[PDB]
Design a protein around this nucleic acid. Sequence first.
RNA 1: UUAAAGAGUCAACCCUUUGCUUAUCUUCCCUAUUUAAAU
Lengths: 301, 301
Amino acid sequence: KLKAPAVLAYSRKINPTNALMFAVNWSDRDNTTAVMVGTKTVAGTQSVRGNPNDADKGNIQTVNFANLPHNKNTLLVKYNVKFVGDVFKAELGGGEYSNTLQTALENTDFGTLAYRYVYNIAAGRTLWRNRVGAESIETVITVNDQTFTFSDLLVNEFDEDVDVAEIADMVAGVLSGEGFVTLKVEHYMLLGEGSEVFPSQEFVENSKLSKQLFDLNGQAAMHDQKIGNAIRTIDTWYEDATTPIAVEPYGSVVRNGVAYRAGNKTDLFTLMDGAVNGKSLTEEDQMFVTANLIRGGVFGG
Amino acid sequence: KLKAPAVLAYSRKINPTNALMFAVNWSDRDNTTAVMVGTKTVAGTQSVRGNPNDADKGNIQTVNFANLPHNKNTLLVKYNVKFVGDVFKAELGGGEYSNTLQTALENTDFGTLAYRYVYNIAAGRTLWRNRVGAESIETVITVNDQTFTFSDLLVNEFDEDVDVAEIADMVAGVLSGEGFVTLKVEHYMLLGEGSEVFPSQEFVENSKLSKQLFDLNGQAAMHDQKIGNAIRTIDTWYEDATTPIAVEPYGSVVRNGVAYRAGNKTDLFTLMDGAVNGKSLTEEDQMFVTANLIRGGVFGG
RNA sequence: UUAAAGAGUCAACCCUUUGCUUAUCUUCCCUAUUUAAAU
């Protein structure tokens, strides 16, 4: 039956870095200034479901903030992304299962996956809720001593483009067996003077602060996993629910509380076992299996 | 019964900026000068109720003051207000309850909420206790390269006006779903020569200073919560108590110690449960549910 | 209530010897977000 080995895992083939935020002007984007974090204390009422009696009591909280300087009206977010090859190479286990999985795969078209991966960056999906309130977002991508500038709208409903396709074919060739390529990504906004920026939060136990933000040497930054999550939001190949989601086994959104691709014969493990055991798959299923194999994880139990 | 989910929260759709104050002249409002704070020491008596034996002793305090310079006679306070649509969309949970609430809503008119939000800024209600002492108040409101000047009195008893409608119509157009609109607000006052100003305070524990003031780089300013709270004081929609209060689940004023809209079959959570379960609400109830929904917070448990 | 009765006392060298020891891959993966006037 060629069952999967008890220990089986894959590495991460898309490596992002921690994004850095700077405050620049629209016409003076050469000189950059860092953004501090700080800490403030606020007061408010107690509006909790189930306790009408204590609605007249106060509430004191300590939080962290992040905003642009009042003399600057442009936010610049810069980071680096690395795409590496050598896909279908298990790090733990695999002497027959991995080879059969590779033979069943690699007939798929990496062009669509590569185009969507680059489009998620160029259109401006990698940057989170900071998007709102901006009248102009400019994306600058540097690779192989060749710069590209994008002002593309319509973050959803991936459309056709000429500049994105040029990087797409470059990424597609690297994905199906090559060395590595790198992309330097910069995002420019037009939020305004004194506007609020939303860096990444983190899990913290009980302390003196109720909301503390992530920072490096006191400068507001964003986690690399958050940047990576927005890149792989290309799972459009299921029955309904447009505005797609990230590619994960049992493709689920914890924030919404729903779990698509449940136990109804559409699973990563079901398709993986089916691919090696005789019958092949369709194009969309191959697109999901390859995209989920580019992402890492442990596949065994 | 379609009970609320465990996690359910909505973001804030109105974004105020930290208002900054400058000292200018009545007919020379072109050039502006910053206002400092400094530190002073004061002396007085001890007035404590219930302790008459120690009323003959002194009292020394160290505080912060802020007054406009002796060469100016007017204060200009400026900020920005951003309105963002995409209401009736919960970022924390909600696939059926949120959708049912969205379906039950938009049967009423956003025009009243849009008119009131603009009128609160226009009348000068955003200006705090420092209103007194000035015989003339001016407001300059700028949006889409179109400036308007306001000198309207009677902040209470919302009346009809012509220029307010030309902004309220667009605000009603942004509230029921589209992108962002940013407005710039400036206020001119006539306190006089050497009059003391009243910037925002902070919550601080025991230290050498008994009362300090919020300032950015040595310049007195106001918290964004102070700016945003005065705008939403539109709740003229219950049994009594004219001169309304701000919208809040179990709307209470900790300053007065009384809790309006208490457990008397009029609660925001009760209206949310009732609207989705068959029988709808009245126009005023919808105008309160929507007003509380525009404001952020978490509703669940 | 097998009731009634009764001095165990004295004295002491445990000494001597010792090699524990050789080899080693912990790997893969990840959205913490949602607000509020200083008493």
